[PDB]
Scaffold this active site. Structure first.
Site, PDB file in Angstrom:
ATOM      1  N   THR A 121     -14.780 -22.841   3.464  1.00 25.57           N
ATOM      2  CA  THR A 121     -15.850 -22.500   4.538  1.00 25.57           C
ATOM      3  C   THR A 121     -16.050 -23.370   5.746  1.00 25.57           C
ATOM      4  OG1 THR A 121     -17.627 -24.029   3.446  1.00 25.57           O
ATOM      5  CG2 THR A 121     -17.428 -21.929   2.640  1.00 25.57           C
ATOM      6  N   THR A 122     -15.250 -24.175   5.981  1.00 31.68           N
ATOM      7  CA  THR A 122     -14.806 -25.225   7.070  1.00 31.68           C
ATOM      8  C   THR A 122     -13.546 -24.973   7.360  1.00 31.68           C
ATOM      9  OG1 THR A 122     -14.003 -27.213   6.079  1.00 31.68           O
ATOM     10  CG2 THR A 122     -16.405 -27.117   6.307  1.00 31.68           C
ATOM     11  N   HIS A 133     -18.868 -32.034  -2.401  1.00 33.19           N
ATOM     12  CA  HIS A 133     -19.832 -32.492  -1.200  1.00 33.19           C
ATOM     13  C   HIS A 133     -20.798 -31.459  -1.281  1.00 33.19           C
ATOM     14  CE1 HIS A 133     -16.995 -29.216  -0.103  1.00 33.19           C
ATOM     15  NE2 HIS A 133     -17.938 -28.765   0.537  1.00 33.19           N
ATOM     16  N   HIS A 179     -23.690 -29.048   1.444  1.00 32.70           N
ATOM     17  CA  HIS A 179     -24.259 -28.284   2.613  1.00 32.70           C
ATOM     18  C   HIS A 179     -25.666 -28.285   2.669  1.00 32.70           C
ATOM     19  CE1 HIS A 179     -19.933 -27.007   3.543  1.00 32.70           C
ATOM     20  NE2 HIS A 179     -19.935 -27.086   2.197  1.00 32.70           N
ATOM     21  N   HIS A 191     -20.624 -27.947  -3.529  1.00 31.06           N
ATOM     22  CA  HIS A 191     -19.355 -27.679  -3.662  1.00 31.06           C
ATOM     23  C   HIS A 191     -18.365 -28.537  -4.571  1.00 31.06           C
ATOM     24  CE1 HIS A 191     -19.625 -24.849  -0.257  1.00 31.06           C
ATOM     25  NE2 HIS A 191     -20.380 -24.225  -1.282  1.00 31.06           N
ATOM     26  N   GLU A 216     -24.896 -21.978   2.075  1.00 36.74           N
ATOM     27  CA  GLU A 216     -23.808 -21.114   2.601  1.00 36.74           C
ATOM     28  C   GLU A 216     -23.623 -19.819   2.195  1.00 36.74           C
ATOM     29  OE1 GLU A 216     -20.317 -23.776   2.796  1.00 36.74           O
ATOM     30  OE2 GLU A 216     -20.854 -23.831   4.511  1.00 36.74           O
ATOM     31  N   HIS A 237     -18.807 -34.331   8.811  1.00 37.14           N
ATOM     32  CA  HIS A 237     -19.391 -33.164   8.629  1.00 37.14           C
ATOM     33  C   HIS A 237     -20.035 -32.840   7.398  1.00 37.14           C
ATOM     34  CE1 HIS A 237     -16.339 -31.894  11.456  1.00 37.14           C
ATOM     35  NE2 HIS A 237     -15.076 -32.422  10.717  1.00 37.14           N
TER      36      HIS A 237
HETATM   37  N1  LIG Z   1     -16.755 -26.176   1.980  1.00 37.24           N
HETATM   38  S1  LIG Z   1     -15.381 -25.815   0.967  1.00 37.24           S
HETATM   39  O1  LIG Z   1     -14.732 -24.714   1.395  1.00 37.24           O
HETATM   40  O2  LIG Z   1     -15.673 -26.196  -0.335  1.00 37.24           O
HETATM   41  C1  LIG Z   1     -14.263 -27.095   1.579  1.00 37.24           C
HETATM   42  C2  LIG Z   1     -13.259 -27.905   0.581  1.00 37.24           C
HETATM   43  C3  LIG Z   1     -12.385 -28.630   0.909  1.00 37.24           C
HETATM   44  C4  LIG Z   1     -12.338 -29.036   2.126  1.00 37.24           C
HETATM   45  N2  LIG Z   1     -11.193 -30.228   2.776  1.00 37.24           N
HETATM   46  C5  LIG Z   1     -11.897 -31.485   2.665  1.00 37.24           C
HETATM   47  C6  LIG Z   1     -11.936 -31.833   4.460  1.00 37.24           C
HETATM   48  C7  LIG Z   1     -12.235 -33.191   4.808  1.00 37.24           C
HETATM   49  O3  LIG Z   1     -12.747 -34.284   4.124  1.00 37.24           O
HETATM   50  O4  LIG Z   1     -12.366 -33.560   6.130  1.00 37.24           O
HETATM   51  C8  LIG Z   1     -10.047 -29.792   2.924  1.00 37.24           C
HETATM   52  N3  LIG Z   1      -9.146 -30.599   3.223  1.00 37.24           N
HETATM   53  C9  LIG Z   1      -7.955 -29.864   3.586  1.00 37.24           C
HETATM   54  C10 LIG Z   1      -6.603 -30.606   4.004  1.00 37.24           C
HETATM   55  C11 LIG Z   1      -5.529 -30.365   3.732  1.00 37.24           C
HETATM   56  C12 LIG Z   1      -4.347 -31.036   3.949  1.00 37.24           C
HETATM   57  C13 LIG Z   1      -4.544 -32.326   4.682  1.00 37.24           C
HETATM   58 CL1  LIG Z   1      -3.087 -33.027   5.239  1.00 37.24          CL
HETATM   59  C14 LIG Z   1      -5.752 -32.801   5.052  1.00 37.24           C
HETATM   60  C15 LIG Z   1      -6.983 -32.020   4.506  1.00 37.24           C
HETATM   61  C16 LIG Z   1      -8.019 -28.642   3.685  1.00 37.24           C
HETATM   62 CL2  LIG Z   1      -6.967 -27.605   4.233  1.00 37.24          CL
HETATM   63  S2  LIG Z   1      -9.648 -28.008   3.121  1.00 37.24           S
HETATM   64  C17 LIG Z   1     -13.162 -28.539   3.142  1.00 37.24           C
HETATM   65  C18 LIG Z   1     -14.147 -27.523   2.935  1.00 37.24           C
HETATM   66 ZN   LIG Z   2     -18.124 -26.993   1.062  1.00 40.12          ZN
END
Ligand SMILES: NS(=O)(=O)c1ccc(N(CCC(=O)O)c2nc(-c3ccc(Cl)cc3)c(Cl)s2)cc1
Ligand SMILES: [Zn+2]
Length: 257
Positions: A196-197, A92, A94, A117, A104, A62
């Site tokens: 946001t994902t 990371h 976007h 972010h 975003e 992603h």
């Molecule tokens: N764009 S943003 O909002 O900053 C933003 C910030 C963080 C994430 N990530 C990383 C996702 C990834 O790398 O695939 C999350 N990981 C988890 C997660 C929680 C528990 C487990 Cl067992 C595995 C993953 C989320 Cl719940 S959110 C996505 C969007």
């Molecule tokens: Zn993000």
């Protein structure tokens, strides 16, 4: 048929797997700068990254994530609108397919070329997976990118990208100092929102800096060479990995300035 950005599994589809996509505190949002309320009770943001330990960079299909050691009180965010201590876990971006889109959040409907972010979790909840289940679990520092002069503190990221072209690839990425990604000013807007994902959990205090950083066209062009697919799969450029602005609903955006 998992979620993504593509022609058939993008943001307008997410609600079917993640109903909270139509929730009451979704992100990103458009920041109407004239309606944001200055809050003199807001504190300066405290960004303490001197001890940050970067470990790895990963193409997760992603975006790419620069991961940190978050097993100790190194690299934290506090102050601002926050109560307590949030520890940096990863950053990371976007970005868009063209310079005119990619962020975003928007500012008075302005899209930036990209948005960084820096993701932090509330130490009160002991780790990141528990934090995402709480309303005050995470604090994400968002920083806009505009295309102009290069960001010398970004180049170490840009140059490793060719080693993580495709989904699932990772590379060692030590000693990267995220202070070199900050703008001069820490003036900010803040509001309660979400990831946001997917899973789109409503666990984020958003802190969006007003001052964008500059990156060069060459640096963002290199972001756009990444791929959403795995190796040995048809090539899909990693571009337009942003969720558009969502309804503000019953929220107030506050300005530190
Ligand atoms: N764009 S943003 O909002 O900053 C933003 C910030 C963080 C994430 N990530 C990383 C996702 C990834 O790398 O695939 C999350 N990981 C988890 C997660 C929680 C528990 C487990 Cl067992 C595995 C993953 C989320 Cl719940 S959110 C996505 C969007
Ligand atoms: Zn993000």
């Amino acid at each position: 048929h998992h979620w993504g950005y593509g022609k058939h599994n993008g943001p307008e589809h997410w609600h079917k797997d993640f109903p909270i996509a139509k929730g009451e505190r979704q992100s990103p949002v458009d920041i109407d700068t004239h309606t944001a309320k200055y809050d003199p009770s807001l504190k300066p943001l405290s960004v303490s990254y001197d001890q940050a330990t970067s470990l790895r960079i990963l193409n997760n299909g992603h975006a790419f994530n620069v991961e940190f050691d978050d097993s100790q009180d190194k690299a934290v965010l506090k102050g601002g609108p926050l109560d307590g201590t949030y520890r940096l876990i990863q950053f990371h971006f976007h970005w868009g397919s063209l310079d005119g889109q990619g962020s975003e959040h928007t500012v008075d409907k302005k899209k930036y070329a990209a948005e960084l972010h820096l993701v932090h979790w509330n130490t009160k909840y002991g780790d990141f997976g528990k934090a995402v289940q709480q309303p005050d679990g995470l604090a994400v520092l968002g920083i806009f990118l505009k295309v102009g002069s290069a960001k010398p503190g970004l180049q170490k990221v840009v140059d490793v990208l060719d080693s993580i072209k495709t989904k699932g690839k990772s590379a060692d990425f030590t000693n990267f100092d995220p202070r070199g990604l900050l703008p001069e000013s820490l003036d900010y807007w803040t509001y309660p929102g979400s990831l946001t994902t997917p899973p789109l959990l409503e666990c984020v205090t958003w802190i969006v800096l007003k001052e964008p950083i500059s990156v060069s066209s060459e640096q963002v062009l290199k972001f756009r060479k990444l791929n959403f697919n795995g190796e040995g799969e048809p090539e899909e450029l990693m571009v337009d990995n942003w969720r558009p602005a969502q309804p503000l609903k019953n929220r107030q955006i506050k300005a530190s300035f």
